[model samples]
Target: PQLHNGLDFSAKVIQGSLDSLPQEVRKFVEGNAQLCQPEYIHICDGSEEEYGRLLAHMQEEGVIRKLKKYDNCWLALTDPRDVARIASKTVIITQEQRDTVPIPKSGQSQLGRWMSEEDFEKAFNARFPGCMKGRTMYVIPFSMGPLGSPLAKIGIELTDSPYVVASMRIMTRMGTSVLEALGDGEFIKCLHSVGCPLPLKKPLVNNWACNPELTLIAHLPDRREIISFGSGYGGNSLLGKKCFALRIASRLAKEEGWLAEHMLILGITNPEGKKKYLAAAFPSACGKTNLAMMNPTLPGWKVECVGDDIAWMKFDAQGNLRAINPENGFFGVAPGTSVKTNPNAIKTIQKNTIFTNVAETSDGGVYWEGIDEPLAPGVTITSWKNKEWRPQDEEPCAHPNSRFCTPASQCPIIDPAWESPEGVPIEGIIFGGRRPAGVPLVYEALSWQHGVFVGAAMRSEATAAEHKGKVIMHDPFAMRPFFGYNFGKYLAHWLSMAHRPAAKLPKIFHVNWFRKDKNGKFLWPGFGENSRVLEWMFGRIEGEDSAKLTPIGYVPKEDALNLKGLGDVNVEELFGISKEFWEKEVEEIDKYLEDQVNADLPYEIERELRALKQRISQM
Candidate 1:
């Protein structure tokens, strides 16, 4: 066995040292490799100059191509034409044997097949043998929160894909600084590969045990380790994202008394220039990023981006809830992102961005599905499928899941304290989802516990955001897929925070942007116009506005909404709540709680649900 930085890579740790690898990988290793004797390449961090050099090298090697119009942007084409988009194939191998992997015992985890730790180690040992024969290993050391902040957690990922390395540079505060800050401290060790084993003399078969197409996303949360193989997609190889930033970090947060949530952090500054920070949770394709960087159309209402994807929150010395965006970049979807939908996002990706699976315009610019603008006639383009395409083509030019990865600083409205080690005090926490009907436009939680209940019962309908059929999905706290621990325990954690004498939890509100009328037209004018709802939320927080108490919660009166520019919007229809729909919703919540979290469901939540049901029935 070989030992490096206290990690043991079994005897079959592939042949050749750092100098023997590819020039692109070798350059990284020589400058940043840390740990291990006869050190295998472990890049601590490369500089901007190195980044440019690497980009040039990647272009030289045909891994990526420079765009014509965007001087700083590049397009990457994945191998295996059909795998142009992210691979949904994922697996979680755990240490327990139950009906499900990881066993949804405490309602913290999902039903997944489990494997013994012994078998896991053995599988990895065999699977990784000779894996690096022709591949180069690049080590990335990243910190989840601020480098020296109390809320920070360090992790290291050893990967073979330069694409993963580039994404890591954008997503995390990686490199030598993290190593220095994390000295002697425990860190999560993540191992990843494209799952491409070196080919011997045998013929290639689709079902080979080490086939490059087979993807695995195994996590040992208890051990704070992740072993991912196959697939080089962002969601799979970017260990800092769902793997550690949410999944593993959520588990650690439970043990450490902090909160790691799949939420967005934004600073809302009203016309008077007074700012209040908010952290909001929404399911996938739910306009979380758009809201984070919202171009408030309301006079004097300004929104600044803080963090777009995730937030790591904890209580400060003053007992106020404080949060920081754990990621330094945004891995946002390409579809439906245009100047009108999100101008800030469009501006942010103008340079130093990585385009994946997006169409290449004749002029070398990137194009996606919803960028509905006319190009010059006879303009030619390269589609995601590598076919010649034109603006007049009836088919979409980009894949639905195409994405752009860029630094958060590129955002036009990024907050000045975006990287503040102390983070910002949060005054509000918003939970929302895409629901076509049944839910109201906006409502406030009666109390912290009620807010928890609201979050626990949050649901959404399918939309173009996820490119899936419309269907109801229970996604508590927008964390159905990322919650690292039991649902019941997670609820208990929220309740515990509310009970803390030093806790000044943020006020919680729930909003629905997808409410529809009889003709199926949206009741709420979303996009930038959604600022109207936020204004109401801020008003409630400041005690400047009053709401009517209802069975659901404190709801705004018809006159509460500012409908200045909105063309003939129906206030009653937008904020209306139906007893029949909510009654059915309450029943669904009861069943969901009974089936998925009965063992861990707290009494308060159960009572709250019952109270809501009774109140609705009486009405």
Candidate 2:
């Protein structure tokens, strides 16, 4: 087997559309290929024509340059769509398989070369030991459209590759009908037969495999490398595994796209509004939906959502801040979210969503309402008396509606107007968390290092120890509020590896949802309810009422916190304490970071943390 160090052929084909590839990307691919010696170099170049030629040519030449071939073995990489094509043809190859043939042009009416099923099986079985045999596998094609498209089909003897091992049947529209029609026992059996595994971890139990980055299936001999990609439904019960896997896949595929979009859009908004935007990263569950749905602003100052879940921000060559939201609707979780934080959001959820029989008690039936077409016929709004009624199983199975399986293409809220290389200047960064106490509800312009700490905060009970050992089982939907899913890791890698152009790091804001009053009452500093409070926190408004123990949303602080009254608290003093708390937290974090830096470890991690720390010290 030979290793590929340069861009994969697929990427090279698509490079025509893409302006440029990141240097780090080039470096990573090269490095990984060198170490792994993959038979083929797969690339995600934005070219369709080249893809057609490359796929066709690989069969003929049998020896694609910049790629290695060994003992009748060949490797070809192409976009997902191309992969779908070969898969449709039922092309099967085995390790002992030997054949060199021609690839027909897209429309050419011809049978190209072929490989023996047994020989190909040998190669696959040799490569992957546990792959289930005799399963009819197809190469599914994916493109940018809400409607499901069936291009062609190819079958392969199942092998161990995690990608293939994970039994994925890409069904859209009516294909999902089976979800509602199947009985519990039959459904369970069906999933097991297909090799989908059950929940293995807690809190994380809702997640599939140990790797949240990819969706896994047991059909493959090995479960690590082979995986699937798509969207994660916050509530759907049927599309669980598919959703999470797709979420990470899609995020990594378009990280820079999201980043650039956010940066540009944020720059166009009013300075005051822009400031608010920069002040928070607002993770998916941290009341971002409530905040996005808010109408809190001066009568003339409007708060419009760029995109609820996916914000693409970027810095242009000219260095201007721009931001845009890719999704048109929110893949929001309904179990914990309430209307108090977002009144309009409730209507949105009630209208354009599928209610699985997972946790809701009003009825045992499941329902679905399309986001844009809430009243669509297939859309479900249920009553307990329906014949379809079944006990909503709380078991963490790979239900289509539960925390997995939503496609980006299916999301109604995406901005069709978005473009590649979306340019924007990085103006601010928000690191949001759920803090219990001793932390400020809001802080302004933290140093870069502080922002990184908050961005990379380990607030969850599960992540409280061991820096490298941290495993994130929460918020898989919007993996990183700033960077999309797997790309979040890519962003971390970039931050750790190289020196970016000289520009101010985005303004940093740390938001705590669990902020409380002296008497221990929860204070939800949301919009509309606490308009004055937000203005005061942002330094936009000054008032005597700021001292009161009043909450922006929810019950009054006096009752919640068990305080004597709003009059018992000093606003100025409380604000001062908030600042002090923020400073202390930053210091503690800094010390922890320093210790990590001093430890014997990767130089890249130390360098990145130090740079990040320097930025936080000033915050």
Per-model TM-score, in order, reads 0.89, 0.45
List candidate 1 segments past 4 Å from native: 1-42, 79-119, 200-213, 390-395, 463-468
Q: What does the lDDT read for residue 450 in candidate 2?
A: 35
**RMSD vs true structure, all candidates:** 5.2, 18.2
* Ten contiguous residues with the weakest lDDT in model 2: 185-194
Tens digits of per-residue lDDT for model 2, 163-198: 221112212221122222221211111011112222
Model 1 scores a TM of: 0.89
Prediction 2 TM-score vs. true: 0.45
Best-fitting candidate, measured by TM-score?
1
